Design a protein around this ligand. Structure first.
Ligand SMILES: Nc1nonc1C(=O)N1CCN(Cc2ccccn2)CC1
Ligand SMILES: Nc1nonc1C(=O)N1CCN(Cc2ccccn2)CC1
Lengths: 238, 238
């Protein structure tokens, strides 16, 4: 349907088996809802030792990805993708990913994700080959592979067939009715669908307010949400 | 040395091969700097079909992880860990992970990471078994495995032997000297180490200011940084 094709450039393509062979994303791939295709810069090297890193001009302790194998891998992925593929570099210097950002990226039918290693890629490749730079969070990882897999997983949820409001989630409960002395809220046992809905929404508003108050600032709360939030705050203040 | 032990509770333990078998984290594991040990709730089931999900009280479209197999897996991981292990649940309702948070978690010698699937785990298990809840970002994934692997990768960088200031990174350049008409900044070719240092720091300040101005607010800039930032801003304003 709205199937998605994601090309990946990575020195460790076998890492992506974690999403292509298991769980929800694994099923998406099996059912041809998601296609993930990997190119390894190591395969585009020509020297005997298949060199994929290179020294930075200006010195320093680190290395960068070697330009020629990486550039050639990217070009190969672009040729396979055809027209309309957006090329993404994952790094801490990119636009911070959130769910709105995920929904934006998910509108793309084709993505190419470039996974950096070492101290990253040549700035001129970012200028000449990368459409958008994104970060999955303000922390530093050993490479772009986990970020790429995280992005793939998040956007995959928006492909129709893959799955079976700005607020944090409400608490959920399952069997048994009592667990180390802790009981399930009686409302959830009541069978009263409307009370249960309002209880869940109220809990969500309360948890967002207590844990992530700044998320509430970004919202235009509905009349019902304003009411339930006021109630939750009143109860919190006893 | 400051080796780290990380217990993992996951319905898809084979996903963690992406970090235990490859790259920097793979080497950490091989060199016994990092130990990652997985328990699968499916192995703690007793029914013929090894059931690991259960219906939420109060209804709704989703499922939760079944309490008994998950609880038993967690208890088993805690027994293996001995004393001092901090138990973490990964979810969008948790404390937002950043590099400071990574450095905090990395001070722990033992971690147990609980990977949720479905609509997550019973709220009472969070109360009774989880020490801390963390989020790797404000977006929704299909399960806690990629978040757990991301956390493991980030904290692993702080284990001594694993690897070979609040600002975004400077641009980096490697061979060739000219790439699609784009040249390497002459300062990086100059061999003047102090000019190169100041240029890199200035670029870092400029990029942070242009891309992530709010990160600058959280910093107490050094005298040198204040100067170079003013210069970068002056040049930006031509
Ligand atoms: N945070 C993140 N959100 O996406 N990716 C990351 C992330 O930490 N990494 C690890 C280091 N990389 C290689 C690198 C190093 C320095 C500059 C540019 N590239 C990028 C991928
Ligand atoms: N963002 C994140 N940072 O850490 N983990 C995530 C994340 O998206 N997920 C996927 C859904 N999970 C299962 C679940 C669903 C609802 C409530 C609680 N648990 C948690 C793991």
């Amino acid at each position: 349907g709205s199937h998605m094709w994601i090309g990946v450039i990575s020195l460790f393509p076998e890492m992506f088996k974690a999403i292509t062979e298991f769980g929800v994303t694994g099923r998406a791939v099996k059912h041809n809802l998601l296609k993930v295709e990997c190119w390894n810069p190591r395969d585009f090297t020509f020297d005997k030792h298949k060199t994929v890193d290179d020294r930075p001009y200006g010195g320093g302790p680190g290395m960068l990805m070697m330009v020629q194998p990486l550039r050639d891998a990217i070009h190969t992925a672009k040729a396979a993708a055809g027209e309309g593929a957006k090329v993404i570099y994952l790094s801490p210097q990119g636009r911070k990913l959130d769910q709105g950002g995920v929904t934006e990226l998910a509108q793309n039918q084709k993505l190419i994700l470039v996974c950096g290693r070492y101290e990253g890629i040549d700035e001129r490749l970012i200028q000449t080959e990368i459409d958008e730079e994104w970060s999955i969070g303000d922390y530093v990882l050993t490479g772009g592979e986990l970020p790429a897999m995280t992005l793939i997983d998040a956007v995959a949820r928006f492909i129709p067939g893959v799955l079976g409001d700005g607020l944090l989630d409400c608490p959920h409960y399952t069997r048994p009715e009592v667990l180390e002395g802790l009981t399930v809220p009686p409302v959830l046992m009541s069978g009263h669908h409307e009370e249960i809905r309002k209880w869940r929404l109220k809990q969500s508003l309360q948890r967002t307010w207590l844990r992530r108050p700044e998320l509430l600032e970004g919202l235009a709360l509905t009349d019902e949400q304003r009411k339930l939030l006021k109630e939750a705050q009143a109860e919190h203040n006893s």
